[PDB]
Amino acid sequence: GKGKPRGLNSARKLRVHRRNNRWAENNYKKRLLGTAFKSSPFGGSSHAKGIVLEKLGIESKQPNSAIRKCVRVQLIKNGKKVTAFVPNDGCLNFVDENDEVLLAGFIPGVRFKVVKVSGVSLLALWKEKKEKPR
Amino acid sequence: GTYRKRFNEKARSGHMAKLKELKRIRNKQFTRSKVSRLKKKRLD
Amino acid sequence: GRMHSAGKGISSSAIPYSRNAPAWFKLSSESVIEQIVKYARKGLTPSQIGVLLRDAHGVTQARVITGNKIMRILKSNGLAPEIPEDLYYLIKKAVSVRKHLERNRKDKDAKFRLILIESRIHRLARYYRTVAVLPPNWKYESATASALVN
Amino acid sequence: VQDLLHPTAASEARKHKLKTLVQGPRSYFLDVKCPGCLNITTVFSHAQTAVTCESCSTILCTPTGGKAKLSEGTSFRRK
Amino acid sequence: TRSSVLADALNAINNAEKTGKRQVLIRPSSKVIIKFLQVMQKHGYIGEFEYIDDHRSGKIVVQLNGRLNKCGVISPRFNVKIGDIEKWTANLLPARQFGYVILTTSAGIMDHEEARRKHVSGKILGFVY
RNA sequence: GGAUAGUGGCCUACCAUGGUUUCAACGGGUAACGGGGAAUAAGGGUUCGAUUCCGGAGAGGGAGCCUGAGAAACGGCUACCA
RNA sequence: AACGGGGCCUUUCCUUCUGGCUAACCUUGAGCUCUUGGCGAACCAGGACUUUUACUUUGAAAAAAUUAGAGUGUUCAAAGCAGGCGUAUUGCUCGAAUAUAUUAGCAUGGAAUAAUAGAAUAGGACGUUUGGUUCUAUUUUGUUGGUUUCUAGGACCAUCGUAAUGAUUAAUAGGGACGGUCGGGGGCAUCAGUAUUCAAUUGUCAGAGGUGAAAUUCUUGGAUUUAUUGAAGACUAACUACUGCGAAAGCAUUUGCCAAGGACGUUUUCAUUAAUCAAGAACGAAAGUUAGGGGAUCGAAGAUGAUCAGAUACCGUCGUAGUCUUAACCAUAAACUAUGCCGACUAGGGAUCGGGUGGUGUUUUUUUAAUGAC
RNA sequence: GUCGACGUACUUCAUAGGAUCA
Ligand SMILES: [Mg+2]
Ligand SMILES: [Mg+2]
Ligand SMILES: [Mg+2]
Ligand SMILES: [Mg+2]
Ligand SMILES: [Mg+2]
Ligand SMILES: [Mg+2]
Ligand SMILES: [Mg+2]
Ligand SMILES: [Mg+2]
Ligand SMILES: [Mg+2]
Ligand SMILES: [Mg+2]
Ligand SMILES: [Mg+2]
Ligand SMILES: [Mg+2]
Ligand SMILES: [Mg+2]
Ligand SMILES: [Mg+2]
Ligand SMILES: [Mg+2]
Ligand SMILES: [Mg+2]
Ligand SMILES: [Mg+2]
Ligand SMILES: [Mg+2]
Ligand SMILES: [Mg+2]
Ligand SMILES: [Zn+2]
């Protein structure tokens, strides 16, 4: 015996035993209880809006440094402050204080990158195909 | 689904009434904000 | 093998292959039956009758000699225990244990053995009720079990 | 090497009663002659009862752990 | 307590084959055991076998020729439809034509190829290969 | 007995004390209309199905009706709630 | 020659009634075929009669669309169910297939596997036995109604006869009984052993105690040590061994009482009564709580001497609760083989514990012997 | 109140072994 019922009329015990045990999985528990988005960086969203507080690396001497591309952003949904990357210092000119920025998942500790500023794509601005509306 | 929060409960008051009645019959066997609750506890 | 224990003993009686009476046995099949009835009238249980016949009369097995089991021979002749023999002895043992417990309330060991004996009565009493040997409303109740064993 | 279908007689004799090819009793019955009345009584080899001669009421055997011990002075034959 | 005597018989045969014994003792006997052994005998996996009567369930002595790779019982005896036989042959046998899956069908106990030829089906008793 | 197109505690009067449940009743949750179907998978399985067809229910929320073969209708009526 | 499917025979046919047709069999006659007249099997239809399922085979059912899939030059294809062939003229013609679909319900062939019921106070089966007490009622009663007769049928009660008259093993499953044992298994009484502490008496006289050295401590009112006693409360050394017993925790002085138990022996008895187990219950080391008793030793807590020296570095003295017990709570352990329970099988060896069998073995019984021990 | 316990979500530390050669 393998420690499980094997009789032909033991379907109920096998079903009930299985149902009780599926709750041991973390994947199952999160999936059913709807808590799988607590771990998500944006709390269930794929993108987040934020307010540019300050450009921390604006003053760093070495051009195009990793620090130069970081911007300190305040998440509008909950007000928590986070750090986000910019593709390059050339794009950092477009970003300035007090604009709405759409963040996306990505110096360790920086997990976000800016994809839109003032409702316009940075890549569109970087390629000189749009103007930032103010 | 029976007693879930509705967008505008006031606009369907009669509906809410039914639910209450149902509860009173269904749960008859048993009967026979964070800040507010914490404030009461600390006051006590 | 033992229920209510860890023992696995196999001591048992081995019935011979041949199902006919021994050649050296030269007593009529009838005459054995009166012997069974006479002992049953004397009060002996079926187990005790078989020991006497086998030990002192050469009756190897009542079924072989007479074609019917001892209990059936007794019932045919109007001799029938009110309750089956084995159930009678289990109740008798439990009554003796209870009489020991009332004087000795700290005898936790006897308290444990009483549960095993009673749980043995209920399993056996449950069997007889199914076959209808025992009336369906028959229960082993602790208080009045002394009456049944008498 | 041995043949299970046709075991040796000594081999079977050594084995336990229930473990032979076809289980059977290792006991037997005896004709015991009372010293007084010279009548014959049938006694089981492993008798559990103090068999008594019916005419003389004399003890013929006494029970023990296994085989019964026959009373001294009682002649016996295997039946 | 003894639940499946056929399981005990098949296990004893497998152990005896493993140890290289030329013959094995099976106790208790049964009609199902005898029919299973007769199927194996027809397919050659075992030799002559002899039933010993002792006024009880009985005994058997089986001659072994060393041609048996494995014999086993499938417990519980699942109800097998004609479509479901091939699944069982795939699951239990190392190859397609290496071995047999024995079924107790309404026409008797038989190997799966005989079942397909006779267009019958039933419960599954075990396998031999 | 009443009522219904009609069976029926559907309701009434009088009677009994019954009925369901560890083979999970009852209560709770459901980001629960159900199915045909969709995806994946070697097979067992797991998940999805408001959404071209079928059936059910609703016409802001409760309640009650006229007409008519057919509606408790709402691109019909009356009251109450918002 | 292998594979499958049907029939018979072999002690093996469902029973009964009615109806329909009629084979074959006997026979006349005319040529294996027709024909006269009997007999009417088989088969079919219906009424009574009737153990119930599980399982599997086959057939219907499971909308269309969707999926798979046959045909077709939508210019190809995704698709769609279209289309194709002649043509001066009137026209001809192939398709719109097929499979799948779980469970439940229905019909059907199997009869392996697994259940279920039957004859035991016979209240049993059968009948061309024989009698009753009942109910029903076709036709003939011209017709209707009522009664009666005969008759038929159903049920019931007796009677007679027929019959192989009716009960599967007894699992190296389980329970029960019996016999002689076995155990540091359990409860209640009882007996003893020194030892520890204390007290009395007793002889002696400077230390005793503890440290790495000291000091708190006791001490000429006699300490420590010595001898004769006495009291109290615990615990059972050596024998003592992973050996024995118990479900586990656990169990060690003698004797008695009470009940319980494994194994062994049995040609005794019952006959599947069994394995595992949510719910529920009994016990559960040590510590611990409630209320009495006891309180020798050791001793959490508390106090106090010294706080110098690293192998002897946490030591000393007093010691509350506890340790013990009675009546109840608590329910935890490395509660360990860090290893579920039941059953089967797969090597040799010699040691040990309990029982049993065998020996013409040693010893004892010192009369034999029989026991006991080897 | 840089409070305790729990639940949840994360971060981090433990990877080299044999043979030849210099
Ligand atoms: Mg196994
Ligand atoms: Mg026994
Ligand atoms: Mg009423
Ligand atoms: Mg859904
Ligand atoms: Mg909904
Ligand atoms: Mg839908
Ligand atoms: Mg509507
Ligand atoms: Mg609206
Ligand atoms: Mg309306
Ligand atoms: Mg509208
Ligand atoms: Mg409308
Ligand atoms: Mg079906
Ligand atoms: Mg037996
Ligand atoms: Mg011992
Ligand atoms: Mg016993
Ligand atoms: Mg308790
Ligand atoms: Mg106290
Ligand atoms: Mg322990
Ligand atoms: Mg085992
Ligand atoms: Zn005599």
UniProtKB/Swiss-Prot annotation, chain A:
Post-translational modification: Hydroxylation at Pro-63 affects translation termination efficiency. The stereochemistry of the 3,4-dihydroxyproline has not yet been determined.
UniProt cross-references to SUPFAM superfamilies, sorted A to Z: Nucleic acid-binding proteins
One cellular component (GO) term of this entry: cytosol
CDD domains cross-referenced by the UniProt entry: Ribosomal_S23 (cd03367)
Keywords, alphabetical: Cytoplasm, Hydroxylation, Isopeptide bond, Ribonucleoprotein, Ribosomal protein, Ubl conjugation
Disulfide bond entries: none
Main location: cytoplasm
Subcellular location: Cytoplasm
GO molecular function, one term: structural constituent of ribosome
Family annotation (PROSITE patterns): RIBOSOMAL_S12 (PS00055)
PTM annotation (3,4-dihydroxyproline): residues: P63
Pfam families to which the protein is assigned, alphabetical: Ribosom_S12_S23
GO-annotated biological processes: maintenance of translational fidelity; maturation of SSU-rRNA from tricistronic rRNA transcript (SSU-rRNA, 5.8S rRNA, LSU-rRNA); regulation of translational fidelity; translation
Cross-link (Glycyl lysine isopeptide (Lys-Gly) (interchain with G-Cter in ubiquitin)): K55
Note: Present with 10600 molecules/cell in log phase SD medium.
Assembly with partners or alone: Component of the small ribosomal subunit (SSU). Mature yeast ribosomes consist of a small (40S) and a large (60S) subunit. The 40S small subunit contains 1 molecule of ribosomal RNA (18S rRNA) and 33 different proteins (encoded by 57 genes). The large 60S subunit contains 3 rRNA molecules (25S, 5.8S and 5S rRNA) and 46 different proteins (encoded by 81 genes).
Family: Belongs to the universal ribosomal protein uS12 family.
Name of this protein: Small ribosomal subunit protein uS12A
Curated annotation (Swiss-Prot), chain B:
Amino acid composition bias (Basic and acidic residues), ranges on this chain: 6-24
Compartmental location: Nucleus, Nucleolus
Assembly and binders: Interacts with snoRNA U3. Component of the ribosomal small subunit (SSU) processome composed of at least 40 protein subunits and snoRNA U3.
Family of this protein: Belongs to the DEAD box helicase family. DEAH subfamily.
Other remarks on this protein: Present with 2000 molecules/cell in log phase SD medium.
Known function: Probable ATP-binding RNA helicase. Required for 18S rRNA synthesis. May play a role in restructuring of the pre-rRNA.
Protein name: Probable ATP-dependent RNA helicase DHR1
Swiss-Prot record, chain C:
Gene label: RPS13
InterPro entries xrefs: Ribosomal_uS15 (IPR000589), Ribosomal_uS15_arc_euk (IPR023029), Ribosomal_uS15_N (IPR012606), uS15_NS1_RNA-bd_sf (IPR009068)
Quaternary assembly: Component of the small ribosomal subunit (SSU). Mature yeast ribosomes consist of a small (40S) and a large (60S) subunit. The 40S small subunit contains 1 molecule of ribosomal RNA (18S rRNA) and 33 different proteins (encoded by 57 genes). The large 60S subunit contains 3 rRNA molecules (25S, 5.8S and 5S rRNA) and 46 different proteins (encoded by 81 genes).
Highest classification ranks of the organism: Eukaryota, Fungi, Dikarya, Ascomycota, Saccharomycotina
Crosslink (Glycyl lysine isopeptide (Lys-Gly) (interchain with G-Cter in ubiquitin)) position: K38, K42
Any one GO molecular function term: structural constituent of ribosome
Protein name (record): Small ribosomal subunit protein uS15
Function: Component of the ribosome, a large ribonucleoprotein complex responsible for the synthesis of proteins in the cell. The small ribosomal subunit (SSU) binds messenger RNAs (mRNAs) and translates the encoded message by selecting cognate aminoacyl-transfer RNA (tRNA) molecules. The large subunit (LSU) contains the ribosomal catalytic site termed the peptidyl transferase center (PTC), which catalyzes the formation of peptide bonds, thereby polymerizing the amino acids delivered by tRNAs into a polypeptide chain.
Family: Belongs to the universal ribosomal protein uS15 family.
Curated annotation (Swiss-Prot), chain D:
Coiled coil: none
Keywords assigned by UniProt, alphabetized: Cytoplasm, Metal-binding, Methylation, Ribonucleoprotein, Ribosomal protein, Zinc, Zinc-finger
InterPro entries: Ribosomal_eS27, Ribosomal_eS27_Zn-bd_dom_sf, Ribosomal_zn-bd
PTM remark: The N-terminus is not modified.
Keyword Hydrolase attributed: no
A GO BP entry: ribosomal small subunit assembly
Entry note: cofactor: Binds 1 zinc ion per subunit.
Gene Ontology molecular-function annotations: RNA binding; structural constituent of ribosome; zinc ion binding
GO terms for cellular component: cytoplasm; cytosol; cytosolic small ribosomal subunit
Residue spans, zinc finger C4-type: 34-56
Top-level lineage group: Eukaryota
Cofactors demanded by this protein: Zn(2+)
Subcellular location: Cytoplasm
Primary localization: cytoplasm
Database matches in Pfam families: Ribosomal_S27e
Modified residues (S-methylcysteine): C37
Keyword Ribonucleoprotein among UniProt keywords: yes
Function: Component of the ribosome, a large ribonucleoprotein complex responsible for the synthesis of proteins in the cell. The small ribosomal subunit (SSU) binds messenger RNAs (mRNAs) and translates the encoded message by selecting cognate aminoacyl-transfer RNA (tRNA) molecules. The large subunit (LSU) contains the ribosomal catalytic site termed the peptidyl transferase center (PTC), which catalyzes the formation of peptide bonds, thereby polymerizing the amino acids delivered by tRNAs into a polypeptide chain.
Additional record remark: Present with 43300 molecules/cell in log phase SD medium.
Similarity section: Belongs to the eukaryotic ribosomal protein eS27 family.
Name by which UniProt lists this protein: Small ribosomal subunit protein eS27A
